[PDB]
């Protein structure tokens, strides 16, 4: 059979695993609702790198638009849920 | 091949239960090995370890069925002092069916197998007694 | 046992078969088939079949050349495999070699039956004819009898070759 | 196994040997020939039905050809079948005659001398 019924908790766990795999972020610090700029002191290019890492993790193209807004892990989870059509 | 069949058949029915059970175990193990080979060929196990596990599981299940069938059938033919009776085979068949259910862990499978294997075992005994031919040599 | 020439040639034949049956890159499979073809030509020559051996070697060399050309185009595989570049190919090659050695050992010192019959060895020189006559070659005469005895064979073979040309051109058309 | 392919004196593709002329030909009112003609008529009706033509009355020449072809083939088929059965009987009788020890004539007892078990129904 094909891929299992991925859930929102799976999306959140994968997103946080990817983010904790970034060198410029201390792992224990970041939360789900932590802004990339204000809380973590990242600039736009680091956000671009994080978005590319998300694209590698979940395997679908996120355009330049609809990526300028995914600014904490939480909106990233929302974007992936909307694109993959998951609700529970 | 046919050597295993003659090895089982040469031992008189209600005698030397250990040797009869050993022969039936060998026949069951051979059948399980054939089934494992075909299942591995047509349904790849995606790894060597999982393939070995599947082959061992199938072979052990079939060998256990054969051993239990042979032991119970010989012991029944011995304690009842009535060889050449399909009842012993039916009882042996039921034991194998029960074992199959135990191995697959299902009552439904176990109950169905006990009835079906037992009937088949009894029919094989009847064919042995009356000389029924499965593969009949041409004569006319 | 005398000079072991025929046995050595047959063993190299089997080794080449194992080499191309392990299925490395088709370049090396073609090499193994070429070695087998030359060795089989030698085997046939050792029995008086000069024309047949040379004929099959010449046919195979031409065939292999086409295969090499086709391999460079359709079976290229950026890292081509040699017999020691992969565990599966090396395992198949070693299994073939070991089975050949085991069969030879079982049939050489003892007289064991594998599938059909058994063998004691004795060298293949034993079963020769002793025939002492002729100002011609029996093999050449038999092959040349194709144009006088084998009219039906010539007819069916020619029709098959013409149909083969038509068939390949139909298959490769596409559209 | 094939039982009469290798019968001695058999011509490969004859379909009707000369000796078959010794047999009475099937009558033209043979019920098997009538069934052959009926099969031809049914074929004609089905031909009318598939072609979307009036089934009973569309083509009388075509239906006539169907019936005639079926009867014509069936006549020779019946002749060959009768010949083959006659051959089987001829060979069987000859073999029985030539092997008397294998088919021994047995003197038959009467039911007054044979003892059959009686099984009451109760």
């Amino acid at each position: 059979s094909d891929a299992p019924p991925l859930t929102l908790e799976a999306i959140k766990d994968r997103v946080l695993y990817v983010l904790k795999l970034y060198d410029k972020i201390d792992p224990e610090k970041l939360s789900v609702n932590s802004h990339f700029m204000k809380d973590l002191g990242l600039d736009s290019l680091d956000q671009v790198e994080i978005i590319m890492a998300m694209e590698d993790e979940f395997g679908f193209e996120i355009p330049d638009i609809d990526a300028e807004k995914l600014m904490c892990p939480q909106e990233i989870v929302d974007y992936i849920a909307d694109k993959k059509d998951v609700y529970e | 091949a046919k050597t295993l069949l003659h090895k089982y058949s040469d031992i008189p029915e209600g005698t030397e239960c250990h040797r009869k059970a050993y022969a039936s175990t060998s026949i069951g193990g051979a059948t399980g090995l054939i089934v494992s080979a075909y299942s591995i060929a047509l349904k790849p196990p995606a790894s060597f370890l999982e393939g070995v596990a599947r082959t061992g599981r199938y072979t052990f299940t079939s060998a256990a069925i054969g051993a239990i069938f042979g032991l119970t059938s010989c012991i029944s033919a011995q304690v009842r002092e009535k060889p050449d009776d399909p009842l012993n085979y039916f009882i042996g068949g039921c034991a194998g069916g029960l074992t199959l259910g135990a191995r697959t862990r299902s009552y439904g499978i176990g109950a169905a197998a006990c009835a079906y294997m037992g009937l088949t075992a009894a029919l094989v005994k009847m064919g042995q007694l009356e000389g029924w031919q499965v593969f009949a040599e041409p004569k006319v | 046992m005398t000079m072991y020439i025929a046995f050595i040639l047959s063993t190299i034949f089997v080794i080449g078969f194992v080499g191309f049956s392990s299925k490395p890159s088709p370049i090396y499979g073609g090499l193994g088939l070429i070695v087998s073809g030359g060795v089989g030509c030698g085997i046939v020559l050792n029995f008086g079949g000069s024309f047949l051996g040379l004929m099959v070697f010449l046919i195979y060399l031409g065939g292999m050349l086409v295969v090499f050309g086709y391999t460079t185009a359709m079976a290229t595989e950026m890292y081509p495999e040699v017999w020691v570049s992969n565990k599966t190919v090396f395992g198949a090659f070693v299994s073939g070699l070991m089975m050949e050695f085991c069969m030879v050992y079982y049939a050489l010192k003892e007289e064991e039956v594998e599938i059909i019959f058994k063998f004691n060895g004795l060298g293949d020189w034993v079963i020769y004819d002793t025939g002492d006559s002729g100002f011609f070659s029996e093999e050449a005469m038999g092959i040349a009898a194709l144009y006088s005895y084998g009219t039906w064979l010539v007819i069916v073979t020619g029709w098959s070759l013409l149909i083969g040309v038509v068939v390949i051109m139909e298959i490769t058309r596409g559209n | 196994m094939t039982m009469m392919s290798g019968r001695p004196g058999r011509v490969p593709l004859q379909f009707l040997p000369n000796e078959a002329r010794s047999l009475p030909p099937p009558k033209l009112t043979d019920p098997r020939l009538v069934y052959m003609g009926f099969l031809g008529y049914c074929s004609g009706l089905i031909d009318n039905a598939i072609r979307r033509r009036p089934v009973v009355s569309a083509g009388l020449h075509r239906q006539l050809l169907y019936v005639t072809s079926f009867v014509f083939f069936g006549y020779y088929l019946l002749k060959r079948q009768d010949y083959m059965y006659a051959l089987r009987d001829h060979d069987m009788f000859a073999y029985v005659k030539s092997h008397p020890e294998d088919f021994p004539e047995k003197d038959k007892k009467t039911y007054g001398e044979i003892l059959e078990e009686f099984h009451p129904v109760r």
Binding site: - | - | I171 | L39, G44
Partner: protein, 347 residues
């Protein structure tokens, strides 16, 4: 493809089959098989549609492996006796090799895997050819060497074919795969009686061929390759669906239809050889074939499925090219049982 090239390729296929059936030399039989395969490969690819390429590749690989095994069996037989005539195959190992090679050529279980795939991959006309004309040569060879066939191996393969055809047909919604599994089961029925009586084998082959021709021509007339496409035919040609239902009943072996004649004639023969369990198993196993014929009869003729609006357009047009032998095929495949004794003309 050019019509002349198509005609010459068809002639080459029939010529290979004829060369197999008229030869007394093993080499000429092998040559006939080679010629048949060579001319058959492009017939399967007449319409390119890459599934046909896959079907042709699978068919070529299977048939070429079988041809290699056949040549090895011939050479072993020659080695153990310097004989080239087709006879009782003096060596038993060669006999086993030839039995397996001919089973692979025919598609008997467990060499049956290629038949559903090849039949689904090719067009309906190619499937008709593959399931009717391709069976003659291996069966003709088997009839000549029947006195030396090991009954155990052949009967095992026949029972496997009947069982596997019956089981495989149950899960199919595609008509061509249904035809392929029917073909496998009928092949098993054909080869079950071969060691006992070759006339029964020929009779079964003829009845199966006429029924298969009827079914394939009916599926060509109404251009349906699936169950749901065939469920639209009642709203365009009810007569075609009715005749299809009758033919499907005949193929299930129901009396008094024609398809009952072979099975009835085989069981009886097998009983004269003291074979009782085997015919009983085969007869009860044929009920699977009957079931998945009856399901198609339900879908196509005995009930009316919903249709589409555009079908109204099709009401205004007639079938242009007509198959002349279809009415005779239907009649022969249904109403023939009373003429059963005519089978004596086959020996």
């Amino acid at each position: 493809m050019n019509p002349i090239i198509y005609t010459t390729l068809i002639m080459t296929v029939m010529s290979g089959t004829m060369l197999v059936m008229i030869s007394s030399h093993w080499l000429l039989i092998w040559i006939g098989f080679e010629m048949n395969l060579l001319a058959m490969i492009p017939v399967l690819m007449k319409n390119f549609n890459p599934r046909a390429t896959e079907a042709a590749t699978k068919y070529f690989l299977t048939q070429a492996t079988a041809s290699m095994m056949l040549m090895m069996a011939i050479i072993i037989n020659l080695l153990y006796s310097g004989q080239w005539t087709i006879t009782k195959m003096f060596n038993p190992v060669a006999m086993t090799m030839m039995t397996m090679a001919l089973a692979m050529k025919l598609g008997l279980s467990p060499f049956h895997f290629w038949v559903p795939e090849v039949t689904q991959g090719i067009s309906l006309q190619a499937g008709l050819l593959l399931l009717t004309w391709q069976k003659l040569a291996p069966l003709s060879v088997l009839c000549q060497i029947s006195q030396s066939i090991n009954p155990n191996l052949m009967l095992t393969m026949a029972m496997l074919s009947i069982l596997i055809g019956g089981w495989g047909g149950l899960n199919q919604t595609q008509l061509r795969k249904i035809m392929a599994y029917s073909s496998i089961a009928h092949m098993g029925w054909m080869t079950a009686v071969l060691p006992y009586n070759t006339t029964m084998t020929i009779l079964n082959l003829l009845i199966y061929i006429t029924m298969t021709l009827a079914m394939f021509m009916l599926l060509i007339h109404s251009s349906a390759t699936t169950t749901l496409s065939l469920s639209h035919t009642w709203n365009k040609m009810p007569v075609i669906t009715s005749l299809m239902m009758v033919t499907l009943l005949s193929m299930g072996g129901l009396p008094p239809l024609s398809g009952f004649m072979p099975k009835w004639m085989i069981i009886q023969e097998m009983t004269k050889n003291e074979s009782i369990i085997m015919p009983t198993l085969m007869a009860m196993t044929a009920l699977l074939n009957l079931y998945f014929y009856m399901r198609l009869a339900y879908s196509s003729s005995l009930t009316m499925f919903p249709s589409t609006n555009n079908m109204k357009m099709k009401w205004q047009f007639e079938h242009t090219k007509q198959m002349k032998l279809l009415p005779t095929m239907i009649v022969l495949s249904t109403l023939v049982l009373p003429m059963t004794p005519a089978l004596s003309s086959l020996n």
